[PDB]
Design a protein around this ligand. Structure first.
Ligand code: HEM
Ligand code: HEM
Ligand code: HEM
Ligand code: HEM
Lengths: 141, 146, 141, 146
């Protein structure tokens, strides 16, 4: 469960990301593909090479979806409803992979937000990402 | 994988009594019912909308038997799982794009099925040995992932 | 989320177990300790030799909690609130272990109830044990 | 641990810049704040109730120093992590009763702290190599568990 304090931390941190989101998203995916190669099995059609146009474009979509969850942090399961169906019936990515990408997002944000990434913010963001992951994975069976 | 000689033995003795046709079809069918997302890899097999369709689908059964065949060979090679499954690992990664995490799932389903069949005989010590075999197999199938 | 067909499946299954809940409970614990030795770190104070009493006794406590969860299936979070409290503030078992005990319960049940352990029933029990685990770790942070 | 020399020299490269006196306390501290359940092993460390109480806790800082010292020594023996960590593995398991999953959490936190301290210089490639390292270290510390 997210608390008032978590919601505040999450909004402040994502607020500083701003118009760098699509870019942090792409970096997170790249970090993911190099550190955990099994994840590449889900993108056999993508040119995954560094600087890939498909990768940057995909980071943007991941980022926008995270921005929509931040914007509706008190109604997440409904704001993400369409995304949760897509994952359950089409994408069907194994739950363990959501942790790998969450971790990579945290790394990406620590790498770019030295001042905002305090123990308490890191804790709230980790919780936030685990709730997003749970929503997107909630209709699997 | 570090198997005790009596563990190596516990596994071999029981396997000797497995009906591969039945067990193979049952393990794969259950993987598809208990973990519906795995169905993404078998679209061509047909109707899999319900448990009955899945358990009755003859292609699922025939594929179950072939998978367990590869598995049997692995028990003849417990001291060299990596080499036995190298090309099968290349295949499952480069052509099929199967996330190895799925190997662990099939492994655990495979264990409940043996329990289901052998009952009292699938004792905790016997289970412990087969848990190592299944992890070992999962790890060898994952080896050539890059 | 558990569907009506899942709830039915779990009451039926758990119904047979009946008086044997305590023993299957103890059996699952034994399978877990031998199959996944890291689980033993949470029980340094118990005698874990085969058939000893500590394990016998704890087996019943686990089973009772589950029986309780089965009878309160439409209301798990409330029926398990104190147990969740106890897990979060005192026991503090890492979340991965819950899957390990869940699997060992499934194996124990498959072994004792060959007729009742159909694939649909297998599926329902797994979702149910996962729902129970989610509840027990809901208040960790 | 299968590590390329590319991986190895980069890992070693960056480590030269690490202030072990600081990173160790940051890493242990963040573990206790981000995954609060891990505090079950450090009650004797006194007050751990708020993020500041943990991060500034002198026993937490002293202890993190010890942790990272032993880690540094593992980077000096990447080809024999298991032997390097065997007595620490026996201790954590037989005396301290620590669930090895906890070594993986610390590994991941440590990677975030690295990232936090080096920014842009913590490139995806460099991260990939550090993930292999913390995985190897976590596996070596778990290896003597029985
Ligand atoms: C933070 C959690 C995640 C979020 C918010 C997210 C978001 C999205 C979004 C918005 C799309 C575009 C889908 C569309 O509307 O057409 C997408 C696609 C996709 N995602 Fe993710 N995703 C997440 C995690 C994952 C991870 C863990 C995986 C697997 C490693 C994954 C693999 C994919 C794949 C394979 C596609 C389709 C790619 C294609 O276009 O062919 N996603 N995701
Ligand atoms: C115990 C681990 C497994 C073993 C030993 C195994 C073995 C095999 C074998 C022998 C084949 C036939 C290859 C050929 O000669 O064409 C095969 C094919 C295949 N395997 Fe696996 N398998 C395992 C697990 C999995 C799982 C967990 C998945 C996904 C959930 C999977 C997905 C596939 C697919 C999609 C094919 C090709 C099916 C087709 O021809 O339509 N495998 N596997
Ligand atoms: C299906 C999930 C589980 C349930 C329903 C469950 C249930 C219970 C119950 C009812 C108790 C006694 C509570 C009391 O003090 O009154 C207990 C105790 C305990 N459980 Fe579990 N448990 C579960 C999973 C686990 C797992 C996965 C572990 C670790 C591997 C674990 C370790 C413990 C420990 C260490 C105690 C305290 C024993 C003692 O010191 O006497 N539990 N559990
Ligand atoms: C990189 C992985 C780790 C390394 C290299 C490491 C290393 C060490 C070292 C050198 C000691 C002191 C040994 C002694 O007192 O003789 C120690 C103590 C200890 N470690 Fe770890 N450790 C690691 C991870 C963990 C984690 C994840 C936990 C639990 C969350 C943990 C729990 C403890 C405890 C409770 C002590 C004794 C505390 C006391 O003095 O009262 N360790 N560790």
């Amino acid at each position: 469960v997210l608390s008032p304090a978590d919601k505040t931390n999450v909004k402040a941190a994502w607020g500083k990301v701003g118009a760098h989101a699509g870019e942090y998203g792409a970096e997170a995916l790249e970090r993911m593909f190099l550190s955990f190669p099994t994840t590449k099995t889900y993108f056999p059609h993508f040119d995954l090479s560094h600087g890939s146009a498909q990768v940057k474009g995909h980071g943007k979509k991941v980022a926008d979806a995270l921005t929509n969850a931040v914007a509706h942090v008190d109604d997440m399961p409904n704001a993400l409803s369409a995304l949760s169906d897509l994952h359950a019936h089409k994408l069907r990515v194994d739950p363990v992979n959501f942790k790998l990408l969450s971790h990579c997002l945290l790394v990406t944000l620590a790498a770019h937000l030295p001042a905002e990434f305090t123990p308490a913010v890191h804790a709230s963001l980790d919780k936030f990402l685990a709730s997003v992951s749970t929503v997107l994975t909630s209709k699997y069976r | 994988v570090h198997l005790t000689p009596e563990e190596k033995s516990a596994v071999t003795a029981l396997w000797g009594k497995v009906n591969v046709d039945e067990v193979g079809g049952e393990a794969l069918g259950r993987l598809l019912v208990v973990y519906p997302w795995t169905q993404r890899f078998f679209e061509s097999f047909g109707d899999l909308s319900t448990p009955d369709a899945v358990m009755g689908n003859p292609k699922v059964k025939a594929h179950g038997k072939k998978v367990l065949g590869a598995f049997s060979d692995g028990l003849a090679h417990l001291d060299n799982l990596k080499g036995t499954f190298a090309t099968l690992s290349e295949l499952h990664c480069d052509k099929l794009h199967v996330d190895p995490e799925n190997f662990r799932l099939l492994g655990n389903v495979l264990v409940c099925v043996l329990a289901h069949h052998f009952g009292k005989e699938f004792t905790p010590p016997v289970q412990a040995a087969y848990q190592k075999v299944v992890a070992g197999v999962a790890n060898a199938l994952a080896h050539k992932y890059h």
